[PDB]
């Protein structure tokens, strides 16, 4: 039931009080660029009692992949295992992991391969304050309240949870459709694409409009009937990535070779199975799509105007 | 609540058709249903059916073979019919309001009856 | 669909606490809290007592309480008095969109 | 239904659960200037089936014309063909195509004729969170929930849709009544009006 | 009529102007009178029963000025008319001035 | 952001029962403190010594029981965490770039 304010009707207890509820999510926008897969962190079940006891809680780091859900205002956690109920959160994350980028770990790593440049924007406010149903995990200590009588003899559920809300999406706050210049990176890797690779991670919840979509079983009906129409949902994403690459050359001295071997031994072998071929990425091939006349393209013109 | 009224064929003969009418007073139909309940002697209460403003009707599965209903918003009254009256059809009929509403898309509230009428005696 | 099944005759001394306890099915009483009670004085309009198993309208004696357990509802009377001298009929809303009624029960002050 | 919170409703009709509803639209402003008509993008019925199956989707490019409606917060799509219901969206777009300018293409064409200037300004937020009525074309997988009993035996409709809201229109956020100087075009056509023509496309929902 | 006053050949009617507006719809209501223009039958699917007759489609909002704040005030500040937009550079022909003021922030 | 997490008493259940699940709340905080320290030296003249004695008598004594052994602080020990090369750490790189 709703605890924000007393309501005309309250849940009658029982065996199943689940309701059909929907909410708009926390707003997010982030773009990470690097030559190694990004790293994320989430709360998952820890090292392993009676049935129904609280799971141990642990912080896990894992490579972010295409299709992994972003945090949505319910926290970055592994719902599949931490919620055996299977109905604590909306339908699109109740059996998934909400990963949040590990900015601290990615920034602090010695070589800075995973993060040349990054942007982020987030915002949310509580929309509604609700209550949870089910047996109480830990009873409220008896020293925090005074026992009631009659209706108040039994405490109501104290497991509160808010429903997030993203507020306004506006064009002035956009992060994309602008050129980012990587002239100087934070880490030691100043934009070098070791191994001939890049990794562009993007989250954009400001274009998340789903399209209601309906079809008619039969056109003979002159009057509207609910049974005669099927409903659907769809979502469309559009992307277009432009890059400017500057060629560089490396002198293979003894010291340089030893340093490059210590940093990553794969480079030297390359210059004469794939470790990352266990993850799902949106493979983008640019081998046949390099052109040296920059002014012929919009990002090229912008780059020329500013060098 | 509201005020209900009763008048109909109090006296009948076997194989006749019974006709009832009730007039709401002090209120309007609104989005509530309206039903009929009878108390034959040596019995309890038997539910008949219900009807709201829009014409939607629900009927008792056993008695729906002889029961029909209609409503009229002009005079604030809803009527009933039940053909082939027998001895067992004798009962003190009543008119009641059904304030039942839906709450949260899954479960109903205020499923009781109320605004009970004093009752009318029909004998076959 | 089916009439609800009840203890047709009940009695107690003045000031006793007696419960009309009344039985149904899963489809009407078990999975739903749509239980209600009626009080029938001789030849009078039935008087609603309790609705939604444990809700009391205005104008009814606070001595009346409602409860439910499994398939069996109850209507508890605290401090048996004169005004309790009346029939009691239960009701329920089944999942099949129909209303049901009990056999009736009658109270008696010894 | 109103899925934001547990509301109170009349006894269900069963058939034709349709209500008289209104909403203010998402706010927008734009001004494209070029020597060729602009290009717009909208989802339509795509390449090719039991009746009632989900139509295929396709991104279509078409020239924007005077009187073509703009995206309203329900998505840029061809409602006429993608919604046979004719009651999914408000009255002024239930039989029209909502088109959105194709900035990517209009900036990536070689000569940059179609577009050498453009401003845009749009904002919205969800006011209410409603639910659709109609047979479900794609049942929820059984892996995502635990079967109920009694009242919750049959799942409620899971086709949610928000009603947009443009929020506040203010004078300081105005694009018009203000001169723009076309002294440095983005593309290669630096303001030359080939054929003695122009095409000024303007949208303004803050004077509606 | 800003367009007309600014487009005046001589620029007498407007040396200097400021303006600030803001509004958002608070509520969404319906009108009652009989429908002047019936909704075309091809914009919807005919209903039945309760939905046999269409509800009034003459919607109207109720505005709201939102927040009045001191940082957005225009008045109690000196405006220097160094250069007018038009051709009249502040000259008060005929020894007259016209100062039109609207202020709904003190109502 | 308190995260609701629950555990089921019995997994051999086909229909949802409120009594079959236990609900819990938990909250996790994550911190990372980085510092840049600069070495300084003090001349122990008579005036400096008397001034420091007036300021806090314990400075000179320590320069040869814990008074704050009454409070609960999140103790952090950095005795083994000092490293001169700033450019190896992100805050050090920012500090170097800021000079």
Residue numbers in the entry:
A (entry chain D): 141 to 188, 194 to 417, 452 to 486
B (entry chain H): 1 to 82, 82A, 82B, 82C, 83 to 100, 100A, 100B, 100C, ...
C (entry chain L): 1 to 9, 11 to 27, 27A, 27B, 27C, 28 to 95, 95A, 96 to 106, ...
D (entry chain E): 141 to 188, 194 to 353
E (entry chain A): 247 to 353
F (entry chain C): 354 to 417, 452 to 486
Lines from the paper:
The HPV virion is composed of an approximately eight kb circular double stranded DNA genome, encapsidated by major (L1) and minor (L2) capsid proteins that assemble into a T = 7 icosahedral particle composed of 72 pentameric capsomers. Twelve capsomers have five neighbors (pentavalent) and 60 capsomers have six neighbors (hexavalent). The C-terminus of each L1 connects capsomers by an extension, referred to as an arm, that bridges the intercapsomer canyon, forming disulfide bonds with the neighboring capsomer and returning to the parent capsomer.
We made a complex of soluble HPV16 L1 capsomer mixed with B25M05 Fab and used cryo-EM to determine the structure to a resolution of 2.9 Å. The Fab bound to the top, interior of the capsomer at the interface between the DE-loops of P1 and P2 and the FG-loop of P1, with a total BSA of ~941 Å2. The binding site of B25M05 at the apex of the capsomer sterically occludes all other binding sites, limiting the binding to only one Fab per capsomer. B25M05 binds with a total BSA of ~839 Å2, with ~679 Å2 from the HC and ~150 Å2 from the LC. The binding is mainly from the CDRH3, accounting for 72% of the total BSA, with some CDRH1 (8% of the total BSA) and CDRL1 (15% of the total BSA). The conserved WGSYR motif in the CDRH3 intercalates between the three variable loops, displacing the DE-loop of P1, relative to the loop orientation in the non-bound protomers. Y100C, which was shown to be most sensitive to alanine mutation, sits at the bottom of the pocket formed by the FG-loop of P1 and the DE-loop of P2. Instead of five Fabs per capsomer, B25M05 bound one Fab per capsomer at the pentameric apex. This structure has been observed with other papillomavirus binding antibodies suggesting that this is also an immunodominant public epitope.
